């Protein structure tokens, strides 16, 4: 039996180590990889270690554990919510800015605790663990989960047994994402995970420093999927004890908070060596305590956490823009962009929330549409440096004609990008309104709809700005 798994993993490693296939074969390759993984998944027993009963049965112990190591356990409780899963509920009125959550370092799971755990020897021998702190944390989590008397066992036994990351999607759920940007990242994720599994399994079956690890007996694809999905759902960057460096960590109590729009209210206290979180807003007793995870896109939320956030104030799409080398004004535009601290060619973001384009993108577009005289005015003269310094400011345009040109180009580009999607916005809305689909299918369709909606809002904003500057020019 182990030899057939070894053959399957060797094939998976070889296929996942091939160069990137061309556009249009990507999906096929993905499906191919899926196939192999499924076979491997079908001959294994799921997670190697499972805990009988339901998750909530373990939440007291966690609290108790945290309580006995210096963490705050007063003022909140673990509660199931329909729209968010398990989370923190205030048992007492909590005022805004009130320090209400703190977790000392001894409770955390870091790369440092991984190096000094049972994984230590293999970590000191394996190159991928040394380079990839997140994979190292995932394997630390795996190894501690299989250790009956681990210090973090009360925390591990409260972790979810599955996630809604694309690694758990059915194939037809992923097919909804075809012709989007996000799907490529999905592909990446899958490929990476697959390759990594095929690598580490081989390592675990051969390296001597892994013989005393609990993974030598059993190490399934579902184990690694769970580990990496737990880490990418819950990893955080924290300073080391002296503060000179950064490391990855899992924060047991605080990572049960759910997300809402707001500001970061979580920081690390080096003197008291503990993570600290103050209330995002006033939470009365019985009200759910939320935090703001970060300024991540809905694509990142779905791919690295497993949920789509409605009314995400920081939602955006990638756009690839550069100055053409066929342009006779390429050198002057390149020099102006360099002086402004902006690359000649790069990836920018289109945001839903006003303004749809950033100061960086606005300055790039203005240089992109400059005439030779305007470029000269921005490259030579006493006023040149001031004009390039106001380049990203909406209040200080280069010329009405430049604005009209740039907004025309942006509108046309966003409309073309819209034309490159398989479905329209109204198709997606109709599907979401009239069809009942899985949670994951709803996430995929809302994601593609959000991409196209950002593009459509860019189209309309560019049209309105083009008309505004045309009208100013007419008077």
């Amino acid at each position: 039996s182990p030899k057939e798994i070894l053959n399957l993993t060797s094939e998976l490693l070889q296929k996942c180590s091939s160069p990137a296939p061309g556009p249009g074969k990507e999906w096929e390759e993905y499906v191919q990889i899926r196939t192999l993984v499924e076979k491997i998944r079908k001959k294994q027993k799921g997670l190697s270690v499972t805990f009988d009963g339901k998750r909530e049965d373990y939440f007291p112990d966690l609290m108790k554990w945290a309580s006995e190591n210096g963490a705050s356990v007063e003022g909140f409780e673990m509660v199931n919510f329909k729209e968010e899963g398990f989370g923190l509920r205030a048992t007492r009125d909590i005022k805004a800015e009130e320090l209400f959550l703190w977790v000392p370092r001894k409770l955390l799971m870091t790369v440092e605790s991984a190096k000094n755990s049972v994984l230590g020897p293999l970590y000191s021998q394996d190159r991928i663990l040394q380079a990839m702190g997140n994979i190292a944390l995932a394997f630390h989590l795996l190894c501690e989960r299989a250790s009956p008397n681990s210090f973090w066992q009360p925390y591990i036994q409260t972790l979810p047994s599955e996630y809604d990351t694309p690694l758990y999607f059915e194939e037809d759920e992923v097919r909804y994402l075809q012709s989007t940007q996000a799907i490529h990242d999905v592909f990446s994720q899958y490929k990476n995970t697959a390759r990594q599994y095929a690598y580490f399994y081989k390592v675990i079956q051969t390296h001597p420093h892994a013989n005393k690890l609990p993974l030598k007996d059993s190490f399934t694809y579902e184990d690694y999927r769970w580990a990496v999905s737990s880490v990418m759902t819950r990893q955080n960057q924290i300073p080391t004890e002296d503060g000179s460096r950064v490391t990855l960590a899992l924060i047991p109590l605080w990572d049960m908070c759910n997300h809402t729009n707001g500001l970061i209210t979580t920081g690390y206290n080096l003197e008291d060596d503990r993570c600290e979180c103050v209330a995002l807003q006033d939470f009365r007793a019985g009200e759910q305590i939320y935090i703001f995870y970060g300024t991540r896109s809905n694509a990142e939320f779905v791919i690295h956490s497993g949920f789509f956030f409605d009314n995400n104030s920081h939602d955006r799409v990638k756009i690839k823009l550069g100055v053409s080398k066929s342009d006779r004004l390429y050198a002057m535009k390149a020099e102006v962009l360099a002086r402004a601290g902006i690359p000649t060619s790069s990836v920018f973001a289109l945001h839903f929330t006003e303004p749809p384009i950033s100061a960086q993108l606005l300055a790039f577009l203005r240089v992109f549409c400059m005439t030779e005289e305007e470029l000269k005015e921005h490259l030579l003269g006493d006023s040149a440096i001031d004009r390039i310094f106001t380049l990203g400011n909406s209040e200080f345009p280069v010329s009405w004609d430049n604005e009209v040109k740039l907004w025309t180009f942006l509108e046309d580009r966003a409309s073309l990008l819209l034309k490159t999607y398989k479905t329209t916005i109204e198709e997606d809305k109709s599907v979401l309104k009239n069809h009942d689909l899985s949670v994951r299918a709803k996430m995929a369709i809302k994601l593609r709809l959000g991409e196209k909606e950002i593009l459509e809002k860019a189209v309309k904003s560019a049209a309105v700005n083009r008309e505004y500057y045309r009208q100013q020019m007419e008077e």
């Binding site: 991928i128 380079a131 990839m132 702190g133 997140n134 994979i135 990446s188 994720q189 990476n192 995970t193 390759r195 990594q196 990496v228 990418m232 759902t233 819950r234 990893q235 955080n236 960057q237 924290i238 300073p239 503060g243 990855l248 924060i251 605080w254 990572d255 908070c257 997300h259 970061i264 979580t266 920081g267 690390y268 080096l270 993570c275 935090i291 995870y293 970060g294 991540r296 990142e300 690295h304 956490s305």
Partner: peptide, 16 residues
């Protein structure tokens, strides 16, 4: 100002 703001579930590169 928080000297070390902590992002929940920060994105890292998984391509080894």
């Amino acid at each position: 100002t928080l000297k070390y703001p902590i992002e929940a579930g920060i994105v890292t590169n998984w391509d080894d």
